């Protein structure tokens, strides 16, 4: 199926992984009950800026888009709008190597935002040939733009998976790169009792002494992270692109969701906790399992176990009713298991990632 | 006897646009036409560049939205708003260069706990059939959200298909009855309008034009 | 193109329509109902403000009967041509000596894009990140006239050595609305005797516009010296429109135009006005200290809902020793049509140094009887605000604590996030009832309103306090906080 | 796995009050829906800085204050035989942003950690203004280039290199910003606690024995779980590109302090001087806290200690196997137990554990 669904249950020790403009924990009302929230942007930044991301995605083999490979295709997709000479000029200004010189490796498909940007460049060099400013004169005024696209042509997977970088030299409407993974707001499965740390600041030269007072809200809790991956869009933005590679990226996303945590007040509260549960399932449509905790989970022996239980019990009755189909696998650290099979039980996270990498086949 | 496609929008958080050129980005109590059109557009795989498919989709279909109040443990849970303090590091100073600010701030209102049942039908000047829309919302090509990518679904889009004369009569067949309805088709004995600037000016990105809902109130 | 003789007005038919471009003649003399059509509400409001200004400049009504007649029945082309003829030479966008709201002979080292005139698009840092680009690329003559007037009146720019006026920064406009654009413009025109009354012509008053007769630098202009013509079309911007270009799509209008503008020239111009000039389009507030009296025009200061402003918008208070004064247009309308329900449109910006934080364009419905029984309206407003302040005070006390008998406070700011909830739930209750009450006999509606707001305050209080109510330290405090809450809530019942 | 070093400590305390509220109540925190007694991480940090062990093995701690009027006198006393008073005044004035008036009391924006070494260094660098006069902003731009040279002087700080500092005013806002390098959590009990209350009196020798109203002091015993984490690379950077071995030595000092140091609150009257009963250290590519081992509040079998150790070991096994972590992992326990599994090497003494750390987990 086209969509990959990632569901994570992770418990956090007393901390404050996300603040508002008034130094208070971000929250969200769910089921009429207040839940502590970790914004999706915080999670997605925590992933995108992580070292694992930089290793497996920042330095992927498919990060570099060679324009010389896209010679023919760009000529037939923009042949309706521009002349061939203009296109060749643009590629010669961007690469910047003129010769053709067929690489003996001419691509079949092209990434959309690429044709979107180089089309803009074609327009610019067209009106530049009409004015007419010579190649050097115009290359002087297009320096920032040319460099701007040159750095983007070396970060294919990053843009394809996370989107453009909030300050990429993109202009055209096609330059607005979304996806390919969608990260949801992480909310607590339960109603949270927020604590207020009441601290002071000791002056070593007047320890008598007038104390510098302060407060800071913190709370522990079991969070439910959800994310999804659009494989078709990931293949299109790397176009490319074989499905297996997209799966290989999806594994990285799974791992990052299972491990990465925002760095807010981690120097003083240190909530470096790993995910206690993570399930992956393929589907024709993305679905969050948030309504499993629509009715606020109440603690029997902690919040974690009844959260796992609530999740599984929800998946049992709800899964088949909705269009979930198959296939699904779950990696957890504690029984019970969902009574329903067709959800393979994985002992380790690496086995789960390997399961994802093989398109969910056993 | 029109054919209706019935969808459900059921995320834990939702966001539906309102007129804004600032950082504060508000929402309404129910989905907007631009929102639903962007939704179906996403499902169908319509890119942002081709004005053609956008125009065709917009002219082709019409909507009716019912607000489903939540009931759990025979208790009513009314809708509520959120104000997310949402910052950006390294945001764009200019549209062309690679120069950036250290930090910019935006405020984004969300909608919890909201659920909606939406019935859509074909216009007479239709360029497609309801079957294509069904097949599209059952197996989308782009990720569907409501209406920010941060907000996922907890119930499948497709709820059902029906035959009916009125959109109200079409909505009555499905379980959460008694909610207010905002449609683009008028029903007898119902008067009130509701003004909103949510019809996307497709020829000119990215701005919107004024339109009005027909309001139906049940119990 | 000229504003009076040429087609610049963008409209669409009431029931269903494709947008058209109209001249002031066809709007004035035609039976068919037109409605404004622009992608931006503030630009529609600005447009309608311009139309009201020009309409008041050309055709002040002799009496109330002529007024009503003009509303229900249009004019003939010859009467129109007769009335506009003395003004035609004043409204040329591009002119040799006196252009419309511009100033020949501007010196600037660079050209400013049209984005600066479009309010909101390029005002702040986040704007570049969150907004669509190229909206100021090319603009029609019409929407540039509109942009210019809007910048002169309701916009806060440009800061620095630039001044706004005459009302001030971000004034709020209040216009009576009708079934049709024509009827709306006419409804907001001041009749000749009342016009003469509000603007005593005495005088030493110059009555020529900023572009006809220019302003002198650093001049001390007494408010009363300004003509009702000079005041309405007052622009302190001191800018010129750069030369136009050819035929194409307009970036903000979306329509095609024969001429488009791609920039303007600006330069600093500073002066001071001594006193308050009585603008008919906006309400003003009278404050006493205490001692000296200070009158200043209404402007949005907070994110609070529009209903909170209602009492200031449709209720005159002359109980100085701290009254407030409704706009002249509304004051006229209540006299001309006492049996009619009101549909008031009001708009404005919120400002931080030539950047927009928020834009509001609301349309408020009042039922018949709003002219009389103003104290009912004031009562509803003060009730809502009263419950608000009750909740906020209670939560603030829960926050800071009670020092005297050593009750410790929570140390968190919950009042601000709860006030937003209260406001959100209040927008559903107060405007809705205020639109549909029989003011003569509707105090029981105010009573059920009190009940609903009371329950709301209870619920929101308990909800906001809930996550912190597990530590005895804070429970002891919330006992007293709750006590004060019910003290205030008890004080809200009649 | 060898960038982050993770320190886990299980330590049981006899009846005490190691950290108080604003109402003199025991600091607490809710974990797993159960109340746990809490010790502030700031409290642990300061307890370390002002400890004798720190003074003996690491050096002098930073001096945190706002009173520049006293600080000028201190700096004039300790640096007067090396520099001129005007130069010192200009130095402190440049760093703080305030002016040294020779007045009685002038304060700074907030509490600031000052180390006398880097201040002396700044005196040497501002003595270059006695040379061919550079503008103060010029000198600033010069100092901006080599920050490492400033961080070398932070080896007389370390607690700043470990916990970081933030400046708002002066030249320190652009030169003194230290980020890393030690992440420590709030010590919470592994079990639910119902705090006891000491109802005390005060005998008046000139009136008593007579009647009197009583006072209250909340106290409790409990098994606390301390967690710390050191980013070695960030520490090396913070010390001006110091060697890794040095950072590991400092790390071992941190281990010892986290295992032995107890906040001195109410110790004159309650005296809970208890050593740690378990100390595990493991190297990893990513920080890892074992707090979720006590998400389900441990219940007492033979005390809270043994089931705490047991739960810790079980959860460590589960996480280690589940996420395929491979240390570099060593555990030191006083009690006889059934812990496992290879290769989380068992160390009989604490010093052998510290030695195991010094040799980068290979020993
Ligand atoms: Zn236009």
Swiss-Prot record, chain B:
Gene Ontology terms: biological process: CRISPR-cas system; defense response to virus; maintenance of CRISPR repeat elements
Annotated signal sequence range: none
The organism's place on the tree of life at top rank: Bacteria
An example molecular function term from Gene Ontology annotations: DNA/RNA hybrid binding
Induction, as annotated: Repressed by H-NS, activated by LeuO. Activated by the BaeSR two-component regulatory system, possibly due to envelope stress. Part of the casABCDE-ygbT-ygbF operon.
Protein name: CRISPR system Cascade subunit CasD
Family: Belongs to the CRISPR-associated protein Cas5 family. Subtype I-E/Ecoli subfamily.
Gene3D superfamilies, per database record: 3.30.70.2660
Alphabetic keyword roster: Antiviral defense
Cellular component, GO annotation: protein-containing complex
Deletion consequences: Loss of resistance to bacteriophage lambda infection, loss of plasmid silencing. Decreased levels of crRNA.
Function: CRISPR (clustered regularly interspaced short palindromic repeat), is an adaptive immune system that provides protection against mobile genetic elements (viruses, transposable elements and conjugative plasmids). CRISPR clusters contain sequences complementary to antecedent mobile elements and target invading nucleic acids. CRISPR clusters are transcribed and processed into CRISPR RNA (crRNA).
Subunit-structure text: Part of the Cascade ribonucleoprotein complex, with stoichiometry CasA(1),CasB(2),CasC(6),CasD(1),CasE(1)-crRNA(1). Interacts directly with CasA and CasC. Stable subcomplexes of CasBCDE-crRNA and CasCDE-crRNA also form, both of which are able to bind target dsDNA, and at least CasCDE is able to form R-loops. CasCDE and CasCE complexes have endonuclease activity. Binding of target ssRNA or dsDNA causes a conformational change in the Cascade complex.
UniProtKB/Swiss-Prot annotation, chain C:
Biological processes per GO annotation: CRISPR-cas system; defense response to virus
Outcome (variant: residue 129 to A): 80% increase in phage sensitivity; 500-fold decrease in affinity for target dsDNA
Consequence of gene disruption: Loss of resistance to bacteriophage lambda infection, loss of plasmid silencing.
Organism of origin: Escherichia coli (strain K12)
GO cellular component: protein-containing complex
Keywords: Antiviral defense, DNA-binding, RNA-binding
Name the record gives this protein: CRISPR system Cascade subunit CasA
InterPro entries: CRISPR-assoc_prot_Cse1 (IPR013381)
Record GO terms (molecular function): DNA binding; RNA binding; zinc ion binding
Induction (record text): Repressed by H-NS, activated by LeuO. Activated by the BaeSR two-component regulatory system, possibly due to envelope stress. Part of the casABCDE-ygbT-ygbF operon.
Quaternary structure annotation from Swiss-Prot or TrEMBL: Part of the Cascade ribonucleoprotein complex, with stoichiometry CasA(1),CasB(2),CasC(6),CasD(1),CasE(1)-crRNA(1). Interacts directly with the 5' end of crRNA, CasB, CasD and CasE. Binding of target ssRNA or dsDNA causes a conformational change in the Cascade complex; CasA is required for high affinity target DNA binding. Interacts with Cas3 once Cascade has recognized target DNA.
Role of this protein: CRISPR (clustered regularly interspaced short palindromic repeat), is an adaptive immune system that provides protection against mobile genetic elements (viruses, transposable elements and conjugative plasmids). CRISPR clusters contain sequences complementary to antecedent mobile elements and target invading nucleic acids. CRISPR clusters are transcribed and processed into CRISPR RNA (crRNA).
Family: Belongs to the CRISPR associated protein CasA/Cse1 family. Type I-E/Ecoli subfamily.
UniProtKB/Swiss-Prot annotation, chain D:
Keyword Manganese: no
Disulfide-linked positions: none
Changes seen on gene knockout: Loss of resistance to bacteriophage lambda infection, loss of plasmid silencing. Increased levels of 57 nucleotide crRNA and also 2 and 3 spacer-repeat units.
Matches recorded under Pfam families: Cas_CT1975 (PF09344)
GO terms classed as biological process: CRISPR-cas system; defense response to virus
Superkingdom to which the source organism belongs: Bacteria
A cellular-component GO term for this protein: protein-containing complex
UniProt cross-references to CDD domains, sorted A to Z: Cas7_I-E (cd09646)
Keyword Nucleotide-binding: no
Key words of the record: Antiviral defense, RNA-binding
Gene Ontology molecular functions: DNA/RNA hybrid binding; RNA binding
Induction notes from the record: Repressed by H-NS, activated by LeuO. Activated by the BaeSR two-component regulatory system, possibly due to envelope stress. Part of the casABCDE-ygbT-ygbF operon.
Quaternary structure note: Part of the Cascade ribonucleoprotein complex, with stoichiometry CasA(1),CasB(2),CasC(6),CasD(1),CasE(1)-crRNA(1). The 6 CasC subunits make a helical stack forming a groove in which the crRNA lies. Interacts directly with all of the Cas subunits. Stable subcomplexes of CasBCDE-crRNA and CasCDE-crRNA also form, both of which are able to bind target dsDNA, and at least CasCDE is able to form R-loops. CasCDE and CasCE complexes have endonuclease activity. Interacts with YgbT (Cas1). Binding of target ssRNA or dsDNA causes a conformational change in the Cascade complex.
Name the UniProt record assigns to this protein: CRISPR system Cascade subunit CasC
Source organism (scientific name): Escherichia coli (strain K12)
Lineage, highest ranks first: Bacteria, Pseudomonadati, Pseudomonadota, Gammaproteobacteria, Enterobacterales
Gene: casC
